[PDB]
Ligand binder design. Structure first.
Ligand SMILES: [Mg+2]
Ligand SMILES: [Mg+2]
Lengths: 271, 280
């Protein structure tokens, strides 16, 4: 096995070594990375100092890059450093789930990285589903949720997304964007969402990553949510990353029902 | 500065390099480690492969090691060394400050990893001085005046502590809310207590107040119990890996609140306190 896979927690995150991301990967390297990604939900690379062009080329080996602008590279979004009601789930989200087809993956690379501050976290939403009790699993299997984003996108997704490559059921509760559960009263929706969001962010479902210059994070948005840092606003250090995302398919629930657009680029550049 | 200090987050945690914990530290090294501990709340060392004797000697340069329980964590010949080898889940579950059910909780602990899984078993700490400062001004003034009852029942210890502990070395106010052991706020109704504790516990475990540490063989964590709470791993229960660590802890003083009032014992026994030291 040419690519070393070093898991970072019991059920999410792995650091990969033995691949040079500045050059085209051969088919075996692509397969190994994709397999590690499906198994560990987010994979990380260290000391991969890339140009935007190389970042796009790497991304294109795994899917179709989506189109904070970077000059000459419409696939690349700038993540630059340059009041809130706080609950345990605040800030946790899955990228652009207000859209009908949320991007299935994102690739984020660190260019200007503080000595400390600015860690990112991910949570395993396949595990979160499996760790619901059986009656709660059967219950959420049949529920739909409305995801909204206003810069206006509104989409009805299954609360349980069936992963198109692994068949796993995912608790698809994207906390920044999921606003209500369809067909239940407002208080029922509020109480159930708080229950599921508390559950989805159990520490034992998460992994935390301390960036360094040249680091790369590549995650499966069909099975995760993530948490951008806020501790970095307390420090003078600059922080600059760049992101690509891969065009996704329309989610389906355990009943085979596809998501449904309700109303509706800006969420691709921001989330 | 002979000891390199590498902070791990904006406000908590630092990895130290340039010191050999197998040999006695000179006064400058002791002072540097102590200063980094006060500033960063928990400090970490890597590739420090210690015997029990060396672990105790290191501990003794910073305080008086506690002297053990007959059974819990007991290591033959080393009363200072503790062996470390359905639930209702809330975001604060498992977060705690060690032995706060006792009148004088230990001021620090030193945990060393001997047999460490390739993955799983991370520990987290939160900065309770920062947690206090990040309460709004009216909430800070409110909790300044409150006391809390901490309880522990070994496999009974009951102490009334200030909700805000004034740190004896830095003078900082600490939101002393030890979630596993703090049971009630003195002098308010049971529902007021429940609702306020849930507010403060949610607050004290904000991710931006925390640092997470992935153990390796030979790693050491040295934390200030007067300014932190920590979270032991649960993701290891799913894995077949052996995990062996050893802990020493340093005898602490009686807490004092912003009004100068010391904590007050309500119930307890020396053996129950030793059990909490061994098990918390
Ligand atoms: Mg995002
Ligand atoms: Mg403890």
């Amino acid at each position: 096995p040419s690519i070393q896979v070093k898991p970072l927690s019991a059920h999410i995150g792995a650091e990969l070594h033995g691949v040079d991301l500045t050059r085209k990967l051969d088919p075996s390297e692509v397969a190994q990375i994709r397999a590690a990604l499906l198994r560990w939900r987010v994979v990380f690379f260290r000391e991969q100092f890339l140009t935007h062009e190389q970042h796009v080329a790497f991304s294109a080996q795994f899917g179709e890059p989506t189109l904070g602008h970077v000059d000459g590279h419409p696939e690349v979004y700038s993540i630059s450093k340059y009041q809130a009601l706080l609950r345990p789930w605040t800030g946790w989200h899955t990228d652009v789930t207000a859209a009908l087809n949320p991007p299935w993956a994102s690739i984020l690379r660190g260019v200007t990285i503080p000595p400390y501050g600015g860690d990112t976290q991910w949570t395993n939403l396949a595990l979160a589903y499996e760790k619901l009790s059986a009656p709660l699993r059967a219950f959420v299997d049949g529920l739909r949720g409305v995801h909204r984003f206003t810069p206006v996108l509104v989409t009805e997704h299954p609360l349980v997304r069936v992963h198109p490559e692994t068949g796993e059921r995912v608790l698809y509760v994207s906390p920044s964007f999921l606003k209500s559960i369809v067909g239940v009263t407002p208080r029922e929706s509020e109480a159930l969402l708080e229950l599921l969001w508390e559950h989805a962010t159990r520490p034992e479902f998460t992994v935390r990553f301390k960036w360094e210059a040249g680091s790369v994070a590549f995650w499966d948005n069909r099975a995760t949510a993530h948490l951008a840092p806020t501790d970095i606003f307390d420090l003078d250090f600059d922080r600059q990353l760049y992101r690509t995302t891969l065009v996704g398919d329309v989610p389906v629930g355990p009943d085979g029902r596809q998501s449904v657009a309700i109303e509706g680029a800006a969420a691709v550049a921001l989330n």
